Design an enzyme around this catalytic site. Structure first.
Site, short mmCIF file in Angstrom:
data_model
loop_
_atom_site.label_atom_id
_atom_site.label_comp_id
_atom_site.label_asym_id
_atom_site.label_seq_id
_atom_site.Cartn_x
_atom_site.Cartn_y
_atom_site.Cartn_z
N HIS D 27 0.83 -1.46 -0.04
CA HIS D 27 -0.12 -0.20 -0.37
C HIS D 27 0.75 1.51 0.07
CE1 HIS D 27 0.38 -0.10 4.52
NE2 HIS D 27 0.39 0.82 4.38
N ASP D 49 -0.53 -7.97 2.15
CA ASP D 49 -0.49 -6.17 1.44
C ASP D 49 1.75 -6.21 1.88
OD1 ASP D 49 -1.21 -3.73 1.20
OD2 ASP D 49 -1.28 -3.66 3.04
N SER D 101 3.32 3.18 9.06
CA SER D 101 3.33 1.87 8.68
C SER D 101 4.94 1.24 7.03
CB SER D 101 2.51 1.22 7.01
OG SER D 101 0.98 2.10 6.92
#
Lengths: 149, 81, 46, 149
Positions: D27, D49, D101
């Site tokens: 992402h 992901d 992240s």
């Protein structure tokens, strides 16, 4: 972790956040005095006289563990110290009355060990009727002649 | 007159209506409706039984899902989350 | 002469279709009972 | 071992050299701010992901080994100390924001234990949504209501 069930503006029993569910005795009239908890969908279970639901993510940090581990000895509960032995929880007769259902019996590390449902009077002491965890699964111990609190 | 052919399949089945009649078919239709009701009642009972199975597992924790899937459908779709 | 109350034939064919309906009802009735039986086993187990 | 993904000259997430691969959340927009790493060919995996590639021989000495071993207690991460318990990593709400992240959660010996993907706010504390190693294989834990950082 403890929340009170109110009925017509009057405390009837309690509700407890144990494990990842939200418990409250089925027999208790009223609705949990907490917005988040009140709007939940509970699954009744007449065998266990239990009525559980799942704890909202924002309160899950507020639950109280549980544990199958319960060695003979003394446990803690709101009115004092419960005693465990012979596979039976007991207390000095008089120290638990109707309207105490739902109250957890903690150990010394805070892990909820059982949840009181009622008690049978057998003289000096009353054998409690509780909801307790087995190897992994829930169970219910009800001494002969219990009076559902 | 009116030919009461046999079939088939059904088709010629309704042709008999003309032969010996007024009635006949209506009673059969009523019987069919009763059969449908029995079929519907069975399904309703089955769904209630499926709930009866799903019960216990309704309180509550790790243990199906699993069931699930094996699951009639509902099992699973709670299993969610 | 003849004119009477059935049923009669068209028989066979008629039975072919009839036999298809009601069997599934019996199945779900039996399954229902079996589920009750198992439930009672659990009740006894507790 | 940690490298930053930049997008329009702005840090979006991170990339990490774990094992013999070069990881970075799928992402995360941008390209790894490192020549050698940027020109690689990554294999996307939408289930995880994740988006891995292989570490060039001249940087393989720079990888970090990981671990499935994570006992309840406190772990280390760039903004402070993460807490692990009940199979859930959490932090004081506010200490993790969008753009975090990819950041690893190390233990006290430096082994990467999980990689942050986002977090769900559940009041005082936020349950992190992480990528963690199981017995041997990768896994992803996403608390109910996570906000992908």
């Amino acid at each position: 972790c403890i929340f009170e069930v109110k009925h017509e503006g009057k405390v009837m029993g309690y509700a407890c956040l144990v494990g990842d569910k939200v418990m409250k005795p089925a027999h208790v009239k009223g609705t949990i005095d907490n917005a988040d908890l009140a709007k939940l969908a509970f699954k009744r279970s007449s065998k266990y006289d239990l009525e559980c639901a799942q704890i909202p993510v924002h309160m899950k940090s507020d639950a109280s563990k549980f544990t199958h581990e319960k060695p003979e000895g003394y446990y803690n509960w709101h009115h004092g110290a419960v005693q465990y032995s012979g596979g039976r929880f007991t207390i000095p007769t008089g120290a638990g009355k109707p309207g105490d259902s739902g109250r957890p019996i903690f150990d010394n590390k805070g892990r909820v060990v059982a949840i009181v449902l009622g008690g049978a009077n057998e003289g000096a002491r009353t054998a409690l009727s509780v909801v307790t965890w087995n190897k992994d699964i829930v169970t219910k111990i009800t001494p002969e002649g219990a009076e559902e609190w | 007159s009116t030919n009461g052919t046999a079939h088939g399949h059904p088709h010629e089945i309704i042709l008999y209506y003309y032969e010996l009649y007024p009635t006949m078919t209506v009673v059969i239709v009523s019987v069919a409706s009763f059969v449908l009701l029995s079929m519907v009642g069975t399904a309703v009972g089955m769904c209630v039984c499926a709930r009866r199975r799903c019960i216990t597992p309704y309180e509550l924790t790790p243990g199906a899902t699993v069931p699930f899937l094996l699951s009639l459908l509902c099992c699973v779709r709670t299993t969610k989350a | 002469h003849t004119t009477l109350g059935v049923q009669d034939i068209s028989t066979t064919a008629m039975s072919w279709v009839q036999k298809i309906t009601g069997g599934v009802g019996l199945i779900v009735a039996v399954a229902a009972l079996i589920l009750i039986v198992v439930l009672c086993v659990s009740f006894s187990r507790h």
